Design a protein around this ligand. Sequence first.
Ligand SMILES: Cc1ccc(C(=O)c2cc(O)c(O)c([N+](=O)[O-])c2)cc1
Ligand SMILES: Cc1ccc(C(=O)c2cc(O)c(O)c([N+](=O)[O-])c2)cc1
Lengths: 116, 116, 116, 116
Amino acid sequence: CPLMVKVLDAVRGSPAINVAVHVFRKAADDTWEPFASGKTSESGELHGLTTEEEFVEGIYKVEIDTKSYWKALGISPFHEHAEVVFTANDSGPRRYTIAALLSPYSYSTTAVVTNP
Amino acid sequence: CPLMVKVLDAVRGSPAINVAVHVFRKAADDTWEPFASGKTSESGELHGLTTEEEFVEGIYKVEIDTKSYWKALGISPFHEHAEVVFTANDSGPRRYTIAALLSPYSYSTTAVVTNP
Amino acid sequence: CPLMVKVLDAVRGSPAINVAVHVFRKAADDTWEPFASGKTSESGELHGLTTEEEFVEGIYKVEIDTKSYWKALGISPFHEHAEVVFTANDSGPRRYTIAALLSPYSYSTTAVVTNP
Amino acid sequence: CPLMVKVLDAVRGSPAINVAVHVFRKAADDTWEPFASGKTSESGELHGLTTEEEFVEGIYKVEIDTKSYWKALGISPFHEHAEVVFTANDSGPRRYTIAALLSPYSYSTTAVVTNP
Ligand SMILES: Cc1ccc(C(=O)c2cc(O)c(O)c([N+](=O)[O-])c2)cc1
Ligand SMILES: Cc1ccc(C(=O)c2cc(O)c(O)c([N+](=O)[O-])c2)cc1
């Protein structure tokens, strides 16, 4: 439950379905190690990336392949991707929802962080 | 130049040009009194709505005709308009820029408030 | 299920809890008739406002009392409220989520509209 | 003036002043090559990063040091930075304005791309 990614389309007012998402964690030697990946479901959500026990303190990067999503709709968007980089679990375990709202020339992202 | 409105298009990545904007001030009977109006320029900006002397404290409404903008582009919009309601000049005269970033099914608005 | 309102706080990265929401529908004589109201729960969501059968075609207004939310946190925000006005069910019944992401001097809103 | 970056603060309702911004171009080996850098002015804008001749087609990254900005304000931020990655000049030279609207737990970015 501790990391969920949600992607919405601001053109159609819909979930953004089948969007690829890759998560990385920064290693002690400062490289980015692959951590998890998946694609958004029919609801625009990607669940099941990690576990409380695996999701230790660290700096995480979430890269959302927004360009492929728009190109499959015939659009050449501005951004190559949307990346979110954040320190997690620095004050103890938390649940993180990373949400992204997509348009061809803009995106917004927010974090909802809760303490279970 | 105490009040400026700027409108941007997140689909095209451009200013939102020729968008109609109406400004109201709340009357004592809580109805909306017409104040100023205009259309955005080629830069997406609308200047010259009021003066220092006329822009006194009060609650103001800015209505942006987003639906007409998207219809003119042949794109289906969700909202009937975008309205921004705010109390002006609470703590001395300010310069206000009201910016709106438009997508068909979402919009954002921010205020940039600087002290002359 | 057909109308849900969700409110998030972009300062704390959290649901916006206990936010008052009033919904209105435009009558045939062009006045706004109260339709439903409620406040957001612990998850930032407000469920149970209406039913498929009551939620007929029409122009609806959702007014979110963002100013009281910020004032209870000690903040004097820019906006008096966040209002969302939209035509619903014009092409047949749909489910609508109206989401608002709040900051003291900005807000975003999106609609997620699905066909059940 | 082909590239300008503008940063705004959604908490204060102001330009985000003195924000560090670094621009990179993707090298043939897929590493990021340093390109230009600066800090936002009192208007929240950063001008003068490049020239027409130097800003050739390529994939560019703009990294905005949002975490340092919020720490300087004494406000806890979520993100380590905000990055914008885009392919420039695909269809002839453009003027790009990259705007970012910052909150502690959310940010938005849009591109305003106009043709000289
Ligand atoms: C909510 C929101 C988000 C992004 C923009 C936005 O992209 C923008 C672009 C500009 O060139 C500009 O000059 C301003 N402004 O000063 O307010 C805003 C405008 C509104
Ligand atoms: C304008 C805007 C941008 C981002 C969010 C947003 O972060 C968000 C988060 C959720 O968990 C969620 O379920 C939804 N939703 O379905 O609408 C939106 C909400 C509003």
